[PDB]
Amino acid sequence: LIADEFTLDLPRIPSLELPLNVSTKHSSIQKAIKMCGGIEKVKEAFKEHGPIESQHGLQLYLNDDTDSDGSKSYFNEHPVIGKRVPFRDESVILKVTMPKGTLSKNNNSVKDSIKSLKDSNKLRVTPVSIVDNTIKFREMSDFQIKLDNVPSAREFKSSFGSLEWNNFKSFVNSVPDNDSQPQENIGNLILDRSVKIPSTDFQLPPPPKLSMVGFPLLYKYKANPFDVKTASFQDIINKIAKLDPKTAETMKSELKGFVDEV
Amino acid sequence: NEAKQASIWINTVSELVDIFSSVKNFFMKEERVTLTSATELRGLSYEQWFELFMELSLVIAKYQSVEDGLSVVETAQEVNVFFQDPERVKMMKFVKLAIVLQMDDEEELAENLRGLLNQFQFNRKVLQVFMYSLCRGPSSLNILSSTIQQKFFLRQLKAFDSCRYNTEVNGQASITNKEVYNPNKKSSPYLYYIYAVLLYSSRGFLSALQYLTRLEEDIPDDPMVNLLMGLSHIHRAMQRLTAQRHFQIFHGLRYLYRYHKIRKSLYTDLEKQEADYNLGRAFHLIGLVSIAIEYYNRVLENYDDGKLKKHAAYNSIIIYQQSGNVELADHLMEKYLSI
Amino acid sequence: VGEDAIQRYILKEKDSKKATFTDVIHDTEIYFKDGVQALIRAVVVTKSIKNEIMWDKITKLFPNNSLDNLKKKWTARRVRMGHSGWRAYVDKWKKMLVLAIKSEKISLRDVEELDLIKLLDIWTSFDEKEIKRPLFLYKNYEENRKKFTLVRDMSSMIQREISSLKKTYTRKISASTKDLSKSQSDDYIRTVIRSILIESNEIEALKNVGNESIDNVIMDMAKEKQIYLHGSKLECTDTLPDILENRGNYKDFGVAFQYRCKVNELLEAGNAIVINQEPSDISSWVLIDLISGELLNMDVIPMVEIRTLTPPLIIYANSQTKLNTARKSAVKVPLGKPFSRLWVNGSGSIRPNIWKQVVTMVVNEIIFHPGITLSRLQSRCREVLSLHEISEICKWLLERQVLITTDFDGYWVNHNWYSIYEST
Amino acid sequence: MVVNTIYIARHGYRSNWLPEGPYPDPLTGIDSDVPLAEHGVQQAKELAHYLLSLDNQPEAAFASPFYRCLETVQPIAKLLEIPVYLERGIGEWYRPDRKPVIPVPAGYEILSKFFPGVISQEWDSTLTPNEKGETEQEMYMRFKKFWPLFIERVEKEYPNVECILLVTHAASKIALGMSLLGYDNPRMSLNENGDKIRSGSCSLDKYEILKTYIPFSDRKWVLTMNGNTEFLSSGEEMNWNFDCVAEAGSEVETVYISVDIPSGNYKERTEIAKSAILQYSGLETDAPLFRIGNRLYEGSWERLVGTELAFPNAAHQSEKIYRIKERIVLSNVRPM
């Protein structure tokens, strides 16, 4: 008795390998595609072509909830970038066709669900498609900065992110027609004290890409293959005191002597 | 009932906007139907009509469509009584930008931002709206990395130096904001910062360190200036031609640890967690994977807030996957990245 | 308001928030020229013997264009068979060539002189021995096993990104028979053979081993190029010595140990170290380790060109806090019957050189791979150590606190990891 | 030989199957020659996209000339851009005692009004059903006679057509398949576990030769696809077999697995050849055996370190997204 000769003429379909544990519910699979920007973005991302260095790819947000004012729950999250696999070895998708409630009795494993029906005629298996294009997330996540307690970031999120008209009027009416102190800290304008911030912080907003490389660099503790030595202890502490006497006085009061690393 | 409430509210306002739009004396290329209506038109003041046009455009973009939001603001930009008032044109440009932010049109965003920066010269709240409007993705990096943006900001920085020293600087932008008061001749930290970002975000690390050191002289105890210096040294040290590689990495770690001390001491637990996460990510960037796992573990084990835990788990998964420890990667996946 | 509103609310919630909300195991819809074989064999014969495709001589075998159609058709043909097909051709050629030399069907001088005509005639005359139809499967699993005894079988940034995207990470639920005892004993024969051949009237460790097994292992080592053989003297090939000499850099660990002690004494004495030039590759380990532990404070000697962005750096201890680790305990080296481990010789003594090399080698692979498991680690060291020998090395390193066990049985390098032994 | 792939498909969902009316009368005026319901309007368009996605599309389509069958092939003919021919030989079955009458199908001249440019007349029928209706024995003999004549007409009327589509009826589909395979009667099971050719709404089969003119009577046909219905948003419905007494139209916990064929290098792609066939044995075991064309393979059961989502609608209101998590990684095998 020969084993059934199934077709491989089948449709070729795209795939997405998420570095997430997506449960079987519609709510879960829906939330997962929303983290990538919706089904339009995912389908478009499979159609990108050209040198891998240039591909914009798909952007994944690990935090993407929405607050009561409709603003993003984590404005500023730099995304995990995914790209199409350059050479995806083709694989066949098989449909396994169990009786109702077989999967749960087998601790949700398909292996055990096959083995627990070894002699049955009910358990159909058939090939359904070949996959030959896949997006994988594989580069590191960028440096993340938290703006939850930065005064100007809260004013921006609660206006330009919420689209609330009361907040938007209050915001634009507060923007000076001309700024007389562009040299001074923005905290002098934004009075709000509900947030702990030091006056040494200028509320400088963070850049859209901090790690200019998605993969770790090859330092490997190797040097690249491609004079204070004469000074006295008093001369060295005097040079430090030229910029800040506090560190110089602290050093003189504590240290016993310099050493050249030779 | 919020989505339906927005639809019902839009449905009441659409009627009022139909009754105001059917006055073709304003909308220059239902006829020239209105003459001599001094301050109120069809029973409401021109101020109330301006307010209805803006509130409608925002509710339309929030609950129904971004392009429909722009069509409403574009009608506002064409109305003479709105165009003729300096307070209204200011408001109109910001409401337009806010709708543009929700569509991925890079060129539109870039042109709106350039318009506001030409108008409100040297203004701090506007410079922050510029950077915050550019916080995420390749679309915003394309804006900051463009040579157009590097030249534009160089010219405003030269114009500020002209106001700061009372002299003509070659290629300076015209001084539209003559209201500046800077008796101690200070830099504008925001201009020097944004210029350092434009260079950094276009791989000019040597140039980024110059303007960042010029910020250190004014604001040495700022978390971001410190971080951006540390990362500049690390990336700089990794280029082909840099001899002194080890020494530059030690300088990198010096500034990252300064950021670390600043964040961990003067702010709440959210920032403490951030400090541990970012510092770990720096060791990862360098390739010192063994040290990175300590910091990521602190992010996971010491604190309660889950937002950064996902990132700490994700990078740890990449490390453990390369180390062949698939079982730990799967435990992390279920514990932190589950849906 | 009547009960109908409460029931409509209850129904809307039941229709949208039920515990058994719509799954995917059901409801799977979600809304939002004829000599081409002679050419292949000529590429295999040339690239296997001479290590390269000798196109100049292949052109003189089967008449075609000067390089172009041969090179184009070969390049087009290989992509239809892939690495799997290439290995099938190479494995078959190697098998035919050893059988031919074993039966003397060619004289070795003809191989050296590259007589492609004779060499291709060898596969020709061998292919005349068997024929078969494309295979088929029976519906009963056992029946296939009865009918057939089937046989099982550092770079640039963009190349790393390409490679990292192709890999799949998967957790093995099951496979064929574990066969652990035979595999373990076979590797124990590898350990004992290597432990003989690495340096030096009886052998003790092989006494209990079956006399049939030794033949298979010495043969496998010959195929894997690990040995040479004079008329009755085996020798190790330079691969085992070189892998230990390159990966076992214990002379560097000796320098790192001295440098850590100098730094510890200076910093505890309240001195400050000043750096103005690049620390060497060894001083790099010990400095980043101390910095990473938050034990050292850093300050900078300011200046006033490019050089202003790279001023001399000063380092010092934060307070009364200690830098030296606690005194060493008597963690004994794992030892046994003579030759039973790579580091144990015939007089039953520790080879201090080999022990210093293997401990350095195992720590070197665990540094950059935090969490590495014993199974993964054996794969990277297969040309040197058996799994049992790595269980011995990892246990000793855990007892000396050089490593910490991650959850799920992985190894992770602790601070002060370079402090293994005094030397240099 | 020319014809080497035969496709057979059941017509769409009939208007008389709905839970409530008003049920529309036959527009062709022939008894029981009812129109397709909205389910048939959608599902015939699905099958057109599905057949367009396969890299082995038909080059000619033969309809049983009943209105429901020609209506079913109309979107196929439009979207695939292929010629349609009548063939009454693949016609419906009616038992001899049918009341009120045995219906006879409409002709090309009137069908041309309902199907302008879709239908073509350069093919007369190979043979035709008895006007007094047919016993199941005479019915099966009709299909037994049909096949050897039909292919010898197809391969001479057309010089190079290799793949053909038949659109037809539940009894006809099963009888055509069983006779193409050669069984003594169409009530037999294909195998001792009791499988039969399925025949639900829009259900499709594929028949192919195993791996110069050789008689069609001498060739052996393999049933390589046997009631494929994955491309239907409502799945297979209204299934029927010769075990049913009545004439046609008058709990499945599915999970997905990926079988991967990793190549020993990163700079290259493992490609499955176009005309290949799959066989397996032992999925219940920890080392299943798989055939994919010429090569044999042995697996290993593995769980993915993440979740893989596949989008079948995105082939080269709702998406049929598959979750993939268990995998069978195939290592090569040498026969010994």
UniProtKB/Swiss-Prot annotation, chain A:
Sequence repeats lie at residues 198-216. GO terms for molecular function: DNA binding. Keywords: DNA-binding, Nucleus, Phosphoprotein, Repeat, Transcription, Transcription regulation. One of its GO terms (cellular component) is nucleoplasm. It is found in: Nucleus. Pfam families: Tau95, Tau95_N. Its main location: nucleus. GO terms for biological process: 5S class rRNA transcription by RNA polymerase III; transcription by RNA polymerase III; transcription initiation at RNA polymerase III promoter. Present with 15800 molecules/cell in log phase SD medium. Component of the TFIIIC complex composed of TFC1, TFC3, TFC4, TFC6, TFC7 and TFC8. The subunits are organized in two globular domains, tauA and tauB, connected by a proteolysis-sensitive and flexible linker. Interacts with TFC3, TFC4 and TFC6. TFIIIC mediates tRNA and 5S RNA gene activation by binding to intragenic promoter elements. Upstream of the transcription start site, TFIIIC assembles the initiation complex TFIIIB-TFIIIC-tDNA, which is sufficient for RNA polymerase III recruitment and function. Part of the tauA domain of TFIIIC that binds boxA DNA promoter sites of tRNA and similar genes. Participates in the interconnection of tauA with tauB via its contacts with TFC3 and TFC6. Serves as a scaffold critical for tauA-DNA spatial configuration and tauB-DNA stability. This is Transcription factor tau 95 kDa subunit. The lineage of its organism: Eukaryota, Fungi, Dikarya, Ascomycota, Saccharomycotina. The gene is TFC1.
Curated annotation (Swiss-Prot), chain B:
It comes from the Eukaryota. Keywords: DNA-binding, Nucleus, Phosphoprotein, Repeat, TPR repeat, Transcription, Transcription regulation. GO terms for molecular function: DNA binding. Changing R42V: In PCF1-6; increases RNA polymerase III transcription. Phosphorylated. The keyword DNA repair does not apply. Changing R42K: In PCF1-3; increases RNA polymerase III transcription two- to threefold over wild-type. Increases the amount of transcriptionally active TFIIIB. GO terms for biological process: 5S class rRNA transcription by RNA polymerase III; transcription by RNA polymerase III; transcription initiation at RNA polymerase III promoter. TPR repeats lie at residues 189-222, 273-306. GO terms for cellular component: cytoplasm; nucleoplasm; nucleus; transcription factor TFIIIC complex. The keyword Amino-acid biosynthesis does not apply. It is found in: Nucleus. TFIIIC mediates tRNA and 5S RNA gene activation by binding to intragenic promoter elements. Upstream of the transcription start site, TFIIIC assembles the initiation complex TFIIIB-TFIIIC-tDNA, which is sufficient for RNA polymerase III recruitment and function. Part of the tauA domain of TFIIIC that binds boxA DNA promoter sites of tRNA and similar genes. TFC4 is the TFIIIB-assembling subunit of TFIIIC and essential for viability. Present with 876 molecules/cell in log phase SD medium. This is Transcription factor tau 131 kDa subunit. The lineage of its organism: Eukaryota, Fungi, Dikarya, Ascomycota, Saccharomycotina. The chain holds residues 645 to 1025 of 1025 of the full protein.
From Swiss-Prot, chain C:
It is found in: Nucleus; Mitochondrion. Component of the TFIIIC complex composed of TFC1, TFC3, TFC4, TFC6, TFC7 and TFC8. The subunits are organized in two globular domains, tauA and tauB, connected by a proteolysis-sensitive and flexible linker. Interacts with TFC1, TFC4 and TFC6. TFIIIC mediates tRNA and 5S RNA gene activation by binding to intragenic promoter elements. Upstream of the transcription start site, TFIIIC assembles the initiation complex TFIIIB-TFIIIC-tDNA, which is sufficient for RNA polymerase III recruitment and function. Part of the tauB domain of TFIIIC that binds boxB DNA promoter sites of tRNA and similar genes. TFC3 is essential for cell viability. Cooperates with TFC6 in DNA binding. Present with 125 molecules/cell in log phase SD medium. This is Transcription factor tau 138 kDa subunit. It comes from Saccharomyces cerevisiae (strain ATCC 204508 / S288c) (Baker's yeast). The gene is TFC3.
From Swiss-Prot, chain D:
Keywords: DNA-binding, Nucleus, Phosphoprotein, Transcription, Transcription regulation. The keyword Secreted does not apply. InterPro entries: His_Pase_superF_clade-1, His_PPase_superfam, Phosphatase_SH3-domain, Tfc7/tau55, TFIIIC_triple_barrel. GO terms for cellular component: nucleus; transcription factor TFIIIC complex. GO terms for biological process: 5S class rRNA transcription by RNA polymerase III; transcription by RNA polymerase III; transcription initiation at RNA polymerase III promoter. Pfam families: His_Phos_1, TFIIIC_sub6. It is found in: Nucleus. CDD domains: HP_PGM_like (cd07067). One of its GO terms (molecular function) is phosphatase activity. The keyword Phosphoprotein applies. Component of the TFIIIC complex composed of TFC1, TFC3, TFC4, TFC6, TFC7 and TFC8. The subunits are organized in two globular domains, tauA and tauB, connected by a proteolysis-sensitive and flexible linker. Present with 2660 molecules/cell in log phase SD medium. TFIIIC mediates tRNA and 5S RNA gene activation by binding to intragenic promoter elements. Upstream of the transcription start site, TFIIIC assembles the initiation complex TFIIIB-TFIIIC-tDNA, which is sufficient for RNA polymerase III recruitment and function. Part of the tauA domain of TFIIIC that binds boxA DNA promoter sites of tRNA and similar genes. This is Transcription factor tau 55 kDa subunit. It comes from Saccharomyces cerevisiae (strain ATCC 204508 / S288c) (Baker's yeast).
